[PDB]
Structure formats: structure tokens, C-alpha cells
A paper describes a structure:
FlcD, an HDO from the opportunistic pathogen Pseudomonas aeruginosa, catalyzes the excision of an oxime carbon in the biosynthesis of the copper-containing antibiotic fluopsin C. We show that FlcD is a dioxygenase that catalyzes a four-electron oxidation. FlcD is a homodimer in each structure. Each monomer contains two domains: an N-terminal superhelical linker domain (IPR037061) and a C-terminal iron-binding domain (IPR016084). In contrast to quintessential HDOs, our data indicate that FlcD employs a mononuclear iron cofactor to catalyze a four-electron oxidation.
Iron anomalous difference maps extracted from our native data revealed that in all cases each monomer contains a single iron situated in the middle of the three core helices (α1, α2, α3), which are surrounded by four auxiliary helices. In the FlcD·Fe structure, Fe is coordinated by three residues that are part of the conserved iron-binding motif in other HDOs—E181 (α1), H191 (α1), and H274 (α3)—and three water molecules to form an octahedral geometry. This coordination is reminiscent of the 2-His-1-Glu/Asp facial triad in non-heme iron α-ketoglutarate (α-KG)-dependent enzymes but exhibits meridional geometry. E244 is located on α2 and aligns with the fourth residue of the metal-binding motif of other HDOs and, instead of coordinating a second iron, is within hydrogen-bonding distance to two of the iron-coordinating water molecules. V278 and R281, which replace the terminal two residues of the conserved metal-binding motif in other HDOs, are part of a loop that disrupts the α3 helix. A second iron is absent and the α2 helix is unfolded near the active site. A flexible α3 helix was also reported for UndA, BesC, and SznF;11,12,16,24 however, assembly of the metallocofactor is sufficient for folding of the α3 helix in SznF,24 whereas α3 folding in FlcD requires binding of both mononuclear iron and substrate.
Author numbering:
A (entry chain B): 2 to 326
B (entry chain A): 1 to 118, 122 to 327
Write the structure that this text describes.
Amino acid sequence: NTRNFSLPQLQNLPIEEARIVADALAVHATSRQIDSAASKLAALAEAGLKGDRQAYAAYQQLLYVLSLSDDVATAQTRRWLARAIYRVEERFMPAADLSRALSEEDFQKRLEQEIAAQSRERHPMSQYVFSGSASRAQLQVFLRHQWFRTFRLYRDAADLLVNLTDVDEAAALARYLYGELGEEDEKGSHPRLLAKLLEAIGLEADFQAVSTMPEEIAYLNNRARAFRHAEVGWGLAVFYITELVVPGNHEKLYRALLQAGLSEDQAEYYKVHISLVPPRAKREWQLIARRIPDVQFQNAFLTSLSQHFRVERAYYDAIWEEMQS
Amino acid sequence: MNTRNFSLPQLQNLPIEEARIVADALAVHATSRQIDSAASKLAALAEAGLKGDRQAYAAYQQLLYVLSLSDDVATAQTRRWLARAIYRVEERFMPAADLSRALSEEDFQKRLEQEIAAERHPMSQYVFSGSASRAQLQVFLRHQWFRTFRLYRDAADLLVNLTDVDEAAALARYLYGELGEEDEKGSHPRLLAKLLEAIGLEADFQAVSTMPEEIAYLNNRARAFRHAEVGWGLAVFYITELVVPGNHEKLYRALLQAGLSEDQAEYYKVHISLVPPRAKREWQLIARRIPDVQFQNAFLTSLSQHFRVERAYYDAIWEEMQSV
Ligand SMILES: [Fe+2]
Ligand SMILES: [Fe+2]
Ligand SMILES: [K+]
Ligand SMILES: [K+]
Ligand SMILES: [Mg+2]
């Protein structure tokens, strides 16, 4: 129950920057140790994003420990250090760079255009599991990685809730979280429903799971960054693409599981996501509609969307390679 | 406008040197020097105020109020960073529970009840008796607004620090109820706004308190709910929500006697539970942590400190109520 705590993960990293981060997380750490960690981390991320493959792997691993470890005693300082890395990352990302706000029509047109080109539904990994062609072993590979995406999604959504100062917008995210965490029954939380499916196909569902897939780490790192961003356009973009527009995959996966011999109860995880409302008829769309006139929101939202698609594609490509190797 | 509870406007209107240092540290481009300078000056100011300097006390509590409870999210992470520098000083001075070994679950539940027993406040007896004028009820409800209107945000900070999925689920159920279930017009802040309108008061979602004891109460409650040792936050959650049915039932009855309709007083009615606190699912948040002595000491320390700031606040409300 400390396997996903910061110190045990840092001690498994031979790099000197991991020792410096450990010092900044100590109980008696001062501003000197914390600032020293922040400077070394920023330099490491800079070197990796400029093309140093070793620095790149190291900074992504350290950002994963900083942003997603479960020892709350170190969380405030860990997120402080993560922001030093995020500032470097956002410098390197291609940016929307609009000078004036798109019209509401033009904004929605751009949104629709990008989703068509990049939807997770068109990826070989998705259609292959859609088609019913996956073996049980390949379904296990798919679902081991679905675990990492699902099991702490609600925590990222809670970070956006904390950043929504308007009481009615906070209410919208609380309704989302209530559904995600099982309404009146904790055993129906969507992490626990997925745990039930994993156990049905002979996998363990580890709530202290730590990924060793580089593309998965990058995906989870990005998702946490976006949902925590003080400019909520970043988090709303990932929330929109991953919750307001994905009831279609889960219907195709639910059907595929029932064909593979799974019961409706064991496949409940995908069933409970099947939905009927278009994205703009969802009450959460108002949070985006409200902000469309502000070009700063438009730039953050569109930049977030494109970066999400890039890391999602690399991740899904890597799962596919694992399924075919 | 509705951005006057942002941090920079408030700091600009505070004519003391520490306010300029803090404002410079909140800029997105602030350097480590600027942030560390503010943290040092705030910690020194808090220590002076805690040791009997009345001007420093008023100054640090006002700065902590701006840091911890302003609504501009652009500065929130650094604001909370600086707030912690003050919290570390405050907690040094607080009388602390000193259990050397953890109590049993049944012994711990009995011990926290003894803290509650240690209400009978003259204001509570006066209001519950039906003796208050509508002008006096206005005094009480003006301050109820400050306690209620952003309570959900403090509970959300506790949710963030509850790593177990089932414990997060319990707080999400609380937040769902607190924010109106399927209908945001029924969120508990908006239910209270309806009651305030009924009695003749405005309900301002950008309200800023000027009562020192109320500021101290809200500052403490945010600190406790945000603490990385969640014994602090679960202690105040136990008080502010799990064991308020009796108080809110008596207030509900008093407001009906004052001529409010059931609908107008819905805010209080929805808090009247049908079972005692141990029979609620939220109790498992506390029962699961009881074998941990650090949890127990933080929980008891937080209870006592919460009751100290609550009593000073209730005394000050009562003084205001008697003056009308
Ligand atoms: Fe879900
Ligand atoms: Fe409530
Ligand atoms: K910084
Ligand atoms: K925060
Ligand atoms: Mg009557």
C-alpha cells in the first residue's frame, strides 16, 4: 500500500535528479531544496524535449511520480514541482495561436473537423476489438491498459471541479463525479465495475498500479496536466472529447464482450456508459459555450485538444503493437 | 462587478507593506525570491499576531483570508503555497492531542463525543425559543450565509486528498446532495439564498466578511479541510455535516414559528437526518482510519481548535444580535 508512493518510486530511479526530488519532499525540506529540485527538473525536461532520449524518459518518469503518486503528505510540494515541468512542456507544444476569437459557428466547425480526423474509434486497436477478432489474450492486453485510463479518471475530473468557481458549474461536475463513482452504491463506481470485468477474464485490478509503458505514462501525465490547468480551457477540452463525445465506443465494446462470452453483469462497465444525448445537448456543454467568445479560452482549448490527440495516438499505437507482438 | 473577491483587487485595497509583497508573489511571472520573501514575511507576521500584537493579528488574518478564499484561479496554487507558510506557524501554537498509542474504535467515538459535550449558548437558546425578532433573525442568517455558501468547496478539497476510491465515492455523494442532485437550482447555497430573500436579505456569491471572528472561522475551516493529514478535515466534516441535524431541526422549527413557510425554510429541513451519525455511510471514513494514532491526534486537535474558533464567532454574532 506504499508501492505507488513517491519515495519508493524515486528510489527505483538511478538518476541524480531523483535524489534531489526526494530531498525536496522531506518533512523538513526548505525553499532551497524545493527550488533546487524545480530547477533540475526544468533543465531535464528541456534537454529531453530538445531530443535527448535519456533525459526524455527520465523527466517523464519523474513527472509521473510527481503528479500521480498517492502519498498525500507530499502532494502539495509534488504538484509545485510538476508545474515547473509543465511550463517547459507547454513551450514546446504547437499552439493554436488565434489572434481573434473564432465565431461560434467557426469554432464548432473546427471542433467537428478535428474530431473526425482523430477519433479513438478509428484506431486499429479499437476497430480490431470492435470487430470481435481479438483473442482472450489480446483482450487481456487491451483491458490491462483500459485499467490505467479508467481507474483514477475521477480524480482528474475532481481537479477541474476545484477550479470551477461558479456554483452551477461546480454542480455540473459534481453530477458527473456522482455518476462516475456509482451514485448510491460504491460497488458501482466505474473503477470497481472495470475491476469486476478484469477479474472475470483472469486479470488483477490493482488500485496501486504503476505503468511501465512510456506512451501510457505520457498519456496519464498529459491528462492530469490538462485537468489541473488554471486555464480551464485545457481541462474542458479533454473532458469534452473523453466524456461528452464517447458513448459510441462503449456500445461497440459491450457488444464485443458479450460476443466473447462475457455476461451482461461482467460487462456492466461498458453498458453503463452507453448514452443518447448529443454533445451540445449535454448540460456540461454550457461551460464551453459560455467561454467561446474569449480568444484565450479558444487557444487553450484547441491547443489542449490537439496535444491530447497526439499523446492518445502514440499510446494507442503502442497498445496495438503490444497486442500484435 | 462579480470579480471583486479576486485576490489582486483585495490586496491593492490593503494599505500594509505585506500586501504589496504578497501581490508581487501571486503574479504568474513571480520569481522564487518573490514567493519566498512573501512566505517569510507572512510567517513572521502571523507569529507576531499570535503573540499578542493586535495589528499583526488583524493583518495576517486578512491576508490569509485573501490567500485562502479568493476566487481568481490563476493565482490559486501560489496562494495556497503561501497559506501553508502561515498554517505551519498557526499549528505550532495550537494545543494538541498527545495520544501515545491509538484508542480503540469504541473508545475513540466516546472521546470525540466528550469534545462536543464540552448547544447551550445563550444565542441558541434565545433563537430556538422563538423570542427573536425578524431583525434579529436577519443577523443570524447574514452569518449563516458565510458558513454555507462555499462549504462545498472545502469538502471538495477533502475529496481530493481521499485516495481510496470508496472514500472519494462517499464525498462525491455528499457533494451531489450539497449541489442539488439533478437540479442546480436546489443546491444548498441556493436554498439558503431563497431563505435569505424570504427574510429580507441579499445573498451575494462574492461576499467578503468584515467580522474578525467570522474570518477566523472561515480561515480555520479551509485550513482543516485542505490539510494533508485528513484527520483535520474529517473532524470538521463530522461537525459541519454529520452532526448538524439537531441544530438545523431546531432552527427549522424556529423559522416556521417566525412565519416562514416550509418551502422558504427548505435549507434547514433538508439537513434533518433520519438516523444518528454512526448509522450514516460517511462514518466509515472515520472508522477505517481509527487504528492510526496520528489520525486520532490530528482529529482531536482539529475538533478542539474548531470549537475554539466557533465559540468566539458565535459569541460575536450574539453580541450583534443583542444590539438590534
Ligand atoms: Fe465513467
Ligand atoms: Fe448541506
Ligand atoms: K513557480
Ligand atoms: K488547488
Ligand atoms: Mg406556521
